[PDB]
Design a protein around this ligand. Structure first.
Ligand SMILES: CC(C)[C@@H](Cc1nnc(NS(=O)(=O)c2cc(F)cc(F)c2)s1)c1cccc(F)c1
Ligand SMILES: CC(C)[C@@H](Cc1nnc(NS(=O)(=O)c2cc(F)cc(F)c2)s1)c1cccc(F)c1
Ligand SMILES: CC(C)[C@@H](Cc1nnc(NS(=O)(=O)c2cc(F)cc(F)c2)s1)c1cccc(F)c1
Ligand SMILES: CC(C)[C@@H](Cc1nnc(NS(=O)(=O)c2cc(F)cc(F)c2)s1)c1cccc(F)c1
Lengths: 419, 409
């Protein structure tokens, strides 16, 4: 375990944040001075749940659900998720001292809130960041105003190529990480399972190689992993968090694809000194994630248990895997000869390279639309969105087999008559 | 008439660099990245509402509630709130061109989210900001890491004293507002009704005097108004927004004291170029406020109508006014000649100056220290909460406080 200097990953503004000058701690007991919840108009709730179950908010629970709650999340959700992270990832940092990157969790208002806060905590203008393009548009949109240089790491069907990362890092010496003025990268960001838009996932062996490069040049890994629970291989690949001997990994998990996107509940797992910075920023922004929505999820998860949760996840994977089977069969049918793709390892996107056409934006935004078919041009997933893209992101989250037949029959036509 | 605003002046390099999503460019569509909501385990909901009513999310409505939604908020809530702001405040900027500061509204994940993003949009390190201490601890905690210099404007039982502001601003010539080296204040922040922690509220005439100075030295007014709907006398004071002929007011409204604090639904009203910067920052952080929680509130507001909402607010004001009376009666009984206090005009707090002591359950009592920029400095003040203590609890709590004061003198 290498010693971490967390202060180098914390901006002046982030470091300046202080805890508020304001038995077992609960808002039920400690909210006497906060707004009186008897004034709130919602009184009880029943929410039906799959397999003929319910969640009930009685009068007391409704008052809690409608009241303020801690910035890091409700304690019982944090506690249940801590145990989930232990079971799934057994992170090395569980019992490290706080100052050495003890594993710490924060519930966030979506995972993207967590990620944004992490990026803001770290990045000064002119810092270098590593990621693999095509990358999620939200991440690129988030990094742009922070004024970092984004250095693109090559990727393939197995995600980031370690040799590319190695080749990028050879630009510095390892000892340059001790010299702020050398500007060695502050972090590597990646989506390690079912990258949006590619559908590609890292292997265990590559993750080990990337982790060791992160030690060698002393940078953080931001493991943005919203499709962790949507891997089609039922043996889930070990995560960067699971290898994190140094406490250099910040992991973002999301409920958005398995439980609800609209509830805006995700969570960060990472070293305590960095997670604390994020919590303090949350505390002066959203204050906390919706108490009501946390209680819906926390109650569901407590009633399910870890087995029930994982069973749910399995049923979600089964649905998306059948959808993947269907979209790959339409691709096989119509696009063989006219386009390239890999089988998605996780998530909900098929990434289609159109052969013999430099850009596909006109092909969609005039020709495909007019034929009642829309897919997404690839340009949005690069730092330079004006550069030509031969790629299309096709979602298999919703469309029927019949709809995928039509869309791809229509795409095949337009590819033929555009060559 | 209306002065021309240079909104660029109030937008950092970082905030100005924010761009909209290329997926904004947008029938069998495989283009979207929405997860399939049929996979989500919550299926329907029934939520009981005060005075006998129910709110129902059927199957389709539940799938919407559990799914991503627009960044500024759901259209039904946005339109209801827009019409609320037009009716209450008649903002002079309603029909201005977008670039001249047309009134815009965003639903936020609580009002504080809106305010934080506004502060972040505006402040470079070393900028001057105006506010009245004692101030909301959360605002001070938000401003500290941005590295602004907080200039304290004097205040009293009627809030900010315009003559202090006048005197403070006279340091600059008004032309200095166009000279970045002079570092004229970028904004004035205040809580105009029921200031946390003082309980004091601005008067109509002072608000007009403050606005006049804001125009002359060209600063924004950040109107943080979460106790607007807890005005005890029920004769509403005109807002800074209602006098905002220039589009220099950003207003924060909260549902935290009247509908729910825990749902994290508030709203931000302001000039479109500034509100757009806040929306773009939201788009890369929370994305939007919870769709479920927005729908709860929107369904409620629509079954109530404006009349149901105001009847609700009316009963909430009566409850807090009755609490104010009880805490004041407790204070009269136990604290006269040991302490001093003004009658709160709104909100949830009694601010108590303890006589003789240089520096300071049931009723939460917090030292005054937490409401100043310099929290290490001695404070003879206590902030006492009256949101929930019963009359018996107030009686005991102040009996105890009187004893502690007497034996410490
Ligand atoms: C919503 C606001 C009111 C809270 C949010 C908070 N965030 N973290 C907290 N930590 S705690 O007090 O130790 C705590 C831990 C629990 F597990 C349960 C509990 F009830 C209390 S309280 C707040 C924010 C800023 C200033 C302030 F005084 C209070
Ligand atoms: C979580 C607990 C620990 C807090 C509860 C609080 N009670 N009053 C508070 N006032 S505040 O920070 O100004 C505030 C008022 C609002 F209305 C909203 C808001 F976001 C913040 S915070 C606590 C702190 C100290 C002693 C104690 F008994 C309880
Ligand atoms: C109508 C609006 C509400 C939709 C429109 C969208 N449809 N597909 C998208 N694909 S995406 O950018 O790759 C994406 C995928 C996710 F799975 C999650 C995510 F946050 C973003 S964005 C929306 C949804 C979310 C955020 C947002 F800016 C716009
Ligand atoms: C809670 C009661 C006491 C109300 C009494 C009112 N005072 N002025 C009002 N103006 S209005 O144009 O009739 C009106 C009515 C609506 F139904 C909706 C709307 F947007 C505007 S209604 C109140 C609200 C806020 C602060 C306060 F001091 C008093």
């Amino acid at each position: 375990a290498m010693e971490m200097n967390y202060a180098r990953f914390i901006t002046a503004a982030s470091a300046a944040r202080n805890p508020s000058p304001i038995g077992p701690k609960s808002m039920i007991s400690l909210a006497g001075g906060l707004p009186n919840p008897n004034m709130f108009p919602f009184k009880t709730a029943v929410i039906t749940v799959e397999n003929g179950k319910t969640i009930q908010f009685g009068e007391e629970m409704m008052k809690r659900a409608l009241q303020y709650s801690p910035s890091a999340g409700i304690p019982e959700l944090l506690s249940w998720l801590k145990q989930l992270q232990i079971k799934l990832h057994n992170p090395p940092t569980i019992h490290y001292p706080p100052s050495q990157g003890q594993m710490d969790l924060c519930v966030t208002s979506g995972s993207q809130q967590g990620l944004c806060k992490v990026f803001e905590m770290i990045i000064n203008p002119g810092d270098n960041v590593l990621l693999d393009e095509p990358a999620y548009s939200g991440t690129l949109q988030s990094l742009h105003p922070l004024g970092c240089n984004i250095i693109n790491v090559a990727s393939d069907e197995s995600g980031i190529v370690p040799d590319s990362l190695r080749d990028i890092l050879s630009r510095w010496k390892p000892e340059d990480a001790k010299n702020p003025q050398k500007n060695t990268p502050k972090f590597l960001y990646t989506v390690p399972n079912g990258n949006n838009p590619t559908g590609n996932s890292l292997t265990s062996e590559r993750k080990k190689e990337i982790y060791e490069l992160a030690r060698k040049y002393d940078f953080l890994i931001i493991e943005d992993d919203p499709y962790y629970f949507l891997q089609f291989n039922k043996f889930r690949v070990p995560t960067f968090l699971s290898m994190d001997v140094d406490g250099r990994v910040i992991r973002a998990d999301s409920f958005s694809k398995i439980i609800s996107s609209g509830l805006r509940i995700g969570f960060l797992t990472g070293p305590k000194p960095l997670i604390e910075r994020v919590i303090l920023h949350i505390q002066v922004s959203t204050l906390h994630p919706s108490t009501f929505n946390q209680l819906m999820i926390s109650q569901l998860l407590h009633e399910w248990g870890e087995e029930g949760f994982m069973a749910h996840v399995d049923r979600v994977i089964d649905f998306y895997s059948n959808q993947k089977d269907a979209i790959l069969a339409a691709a096989d049918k119509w696009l063989t000869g006219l386009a390239e793709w890999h089988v998605p390892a996780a998530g909900m996107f098929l990434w289609i390279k159109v052969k013999g056409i430099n850009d596909v934006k006109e092909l969609i935004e005039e020709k495909a639309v007019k034929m009642g078919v829309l897919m997404l041009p690839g340009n949005a997933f690069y730092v330079d969105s004006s550069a030509p893209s031969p790629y299309l992101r096709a979602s298999f989250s919703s469309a029927s087999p019949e709809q995928m037949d039509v869309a791809f029959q229509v795409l095949a036509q337009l590819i033929k008559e555009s060559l």
